Scaffold this active site. Structure first.
Site, PDB file in Angstrom:
ATOM      1  N   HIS C  27       0.772  -1.228   0.000  1.00 17.65           N
ATOM      2  CA  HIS C  27       0.000   0.000   0.000  1.00 17.65           C
ATOM      3  C   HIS C  27       0.820   1.304   0.000  1.00 17.65           C
ATOM      4  O   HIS C  27       0.337   2.330  -0.474  1.00 17.65           O
ATOM      5  CB  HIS C  27      -1.112  -0.016   1.104  1.00 17.65           C
ATOM      6  CG  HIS C  27      -0.635   0.229   2.517  1.00 17.65           C
ATOM      7  ND1 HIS C  27      -0.013  -0.745   3.277  1.00 17.65           N
ATOM      8  CD2 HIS C  27      -0.649   1.346   3.284  1.00 17.65           C
ATOM      9  CE1 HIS C  27       0.352  -0.227   4.439  1.00 17.65           C
ATOM     10  NE2 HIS C  27      -0.023   1.038   4.465  1.00 17.65           N
ATOM     11  N   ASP C  49      -0.620  -7.572   1.581  1.00 20.82           N
ATOM     12  CA  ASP C  49      -0.309  -6.134   1.588  1.00 20.82           C
ATOM     13  C   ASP C  49       1.201  -5.995   1.633  1.00 20.82           C
ATOM     14  O   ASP C  49       1.743  -5.076   2.216  1.00 20.82           O
ATOM     15  CB  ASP C  49      -0.977  -5.420   2.786  1.00 20.82           C
ATOM     16  CG  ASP C  49      -0.717  -3.870   2.833  1.00 20.82           C
ATOM     17  OD1 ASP C  49      -0.021  -3.311   1.949  1.00 20.82           O
ATOM     18  OD2 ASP C  49      -1.222  -3.198   3.773  1.00 20.82           O
ATOM     19  N   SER C 101       4.322   2.490   8.460  1.00 22.80           N
ATOM     20  CA  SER C 101       4.286   1.184   7.837  1.00 22.80           C
ATOM     21  C   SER C 101       5.684   0.662   7.572  1.00 22.80           C
ATOM     22  O   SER C 101       6.643   1.430   7.479  1.00 22.80           O
ATOM     23  CB  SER C 101       3.503   1.248   6.540  1.00 22.80           C
ATOM     24  OG  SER C 101       2.122   1.175   6.813  1.00 22.80           O
TER      25      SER C 101
END
EC number: 3.4.21.90
Lengths: 149, 149, 149, 149, 149, 149
Positions: C27, C49, C101
């Site tokens: 992402h 992901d 992230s």
């Protein structure tokens, strides 16, 4: 790369050596506080609010690297961070006051991503007026309501 | 360029090496805390409140550059900014206390624009008493109500 | 192991070198701010992901170690602790903001126990959305109400 | 004598070298952060909440001394004082938090009088759960309401 | 010189090696936390609240020096100063709490001038109860209202 | 140069080695806490409140320099500044308490300008009672209302 541009003892801005040229925002009053640099032949563009001069061999070692690669994210500058998104740079209103022209905004690898000229205070964030690169070109991005630092 | 002028262990002012001369405000008590500099032949002018001496070859490398080019705007000094307008320098009252003589006011490129001698406190701003250049000359600008630092 | 993934000068996330692969949460916008890493062949899984790439020999020295051994207890991360219980990771709401992230959650011996992708704020504690291992496999644990950082 | 017992980078307790044995409270998760000590043969008693191992010759120099002589009065520990009366040790509630297992309580001559395992918070004072000696024996004194640190 | 006298893990006082003897205030519970010192033959005087033992050859190097020369003025101790006047020692009430027995009060040259046993709190100043020398003798000075530390 | 003059463990004043003599204010109780210095032949003048002794060869290296040159201005001492004007020394009331005798007041070059004996508290400023030099002489300046420190 940063060299200060003094005017009657008052530091009015800065001048970075980016690549093979010595850049300085045209609007800035004063002369570069480096003997060798002052003596060079400066070409001035009012379009880009710039005034560059091709660097002498002995100073090319201290010359910084530049880049067009500017992905959205965060950059570094004298006064901390610079948010970069929407082809726009921003800093928290108050980090950049006048006298901050000619300072570079660089990435985490050192490369100079842009050079500040001034900024439009729009609340909590000020959208910076900059000189940026673009696939072997020198562009100038400036927001409405921009002051000159 | 700045070298402190001590007097019986008490620092009373400073001495800058501007160009090819070593300057020191005459009014300042004490001797320069640099062996080589103390031993030089000093010429004193009461007109300019100065006391200069031509720099030795080995120190000329550490010699700073000076300039007459002093456009209206902002300058740098030990205690921050210096407003320069109306052929007058000013600092916010309280930045410069006594003992600040001989300090240089420079531009963003390093060049020394003037040398502080003292200042006239006129409210929020103190109008500085200085030694400044003028197209190959050394002038002295001093405001009414000026103290000596 | 952590390498930041920049997007137009804005740091948008990170990329860790865990074992023999270079991982990066799919992402995340931008490119890895490491020349060598950017040039690699990335395979992307929307299921996990993730977007991994097998590490080059010269970087394998800086490659971190990973592990499935994750007993209930406390783990370490950039923003302090991470409670781990009920096959669930949690951090005190507010430690992890977007832009976190690709950061690893590791044990006291250095081993990387999981990689953050985002988190579901559920009061005082946020239950982290992670990429974790499982006896020679790469699983993905994600809570309802999860945002992407 | 104190050597910390780490668990996945998280210090969970301690291990003292008292006399000729290396002691460690059995309940404590992790391994001793000393190479040589980890490699030893540990015998575990659930009765005494202990897990001792006979010290190697090269470490016996750093081995501390122990004692049964524990007259009523005050003792020393990492977190200040320890009241000792009624065959009971006590510290002001709050000095000892979890993670304080394996720490020694010693006298003013250095001798180790006991080793903490946990404690029962009873108001202003917490009555410590300890491993103590007794005329060439290792006893264990533990109060009702005791937690394990 | 100071060696702590522990009692069941609780430090109850101290023991200094002054000259050729190892001193320890008799009233103090516990044993010396030094193997070699504990094993010695101790002689106890209830008159002087002392319990000395002649030092072993290998420890005589770490033996401190003592003195009778105690002119009015200020002395040093663990808890700062000690006023000395009127053949009396005093410290600001609160510097010395129980558990401070056996500590030495020394001069600026290191020499031990006296050894604390306890003290009489008399307002802002506490008049110390001490063991002091006197032209090749060991005297004991103690004030009315004295506690034992 | 400063050596403390102890009296029964209580520091009552000081003694400086100025030039070739060891000075000490006569009024001060006690002996010099330096073996060699105590053993010397001291001559006492009640006129100057002094008690000097000619320095031994091995200590002359640690001997400080003195001077009569004392221009109006500021001097240094243990407790900061000393205003000097009107042939008078002054310190802000409260910097010098009793026990400050024998301390030197020196210039910025180290030279000892005078030696404190006591002082007359006159409001915000205390006018110091001193021993000062005078073109190869030792004078004594003392203000009305002077205490002895």
């Amino acid at each position: 790369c940063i060299f200060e541009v003094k005017h009657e003892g008052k530091v009015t801005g800065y001048a970075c050596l980016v690549g093979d040229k010595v850049m300085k925002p045209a609007h800035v009053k004063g002369v570069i506080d480096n003997a060798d640099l002052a003596k060079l032949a400066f070409k001035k563009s009012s379009k880009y609010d710039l005034e560059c001069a091709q660097i002498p061999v002995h100073m090319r070692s201290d010359a910084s690297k530049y880049t067009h690669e500017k992905p959205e994210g965060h950059y570094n500058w004298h006064h901390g961070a610079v948010q970069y998104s929407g082809g726009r740079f921003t800093i928290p209103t108050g980090a950049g006051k006048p006298g901050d022209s000619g300072r570079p905004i660089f990435d985490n690898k050192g490369r100079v991503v842009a050079i500040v000229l001034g900024g439009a205070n729009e609340g909590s964030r000020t959208a910076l007026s900059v000189v940026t690169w673009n696939k072997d070109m020198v562009t100038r991005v400036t927001p409405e309501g921009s002051e000159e630092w």
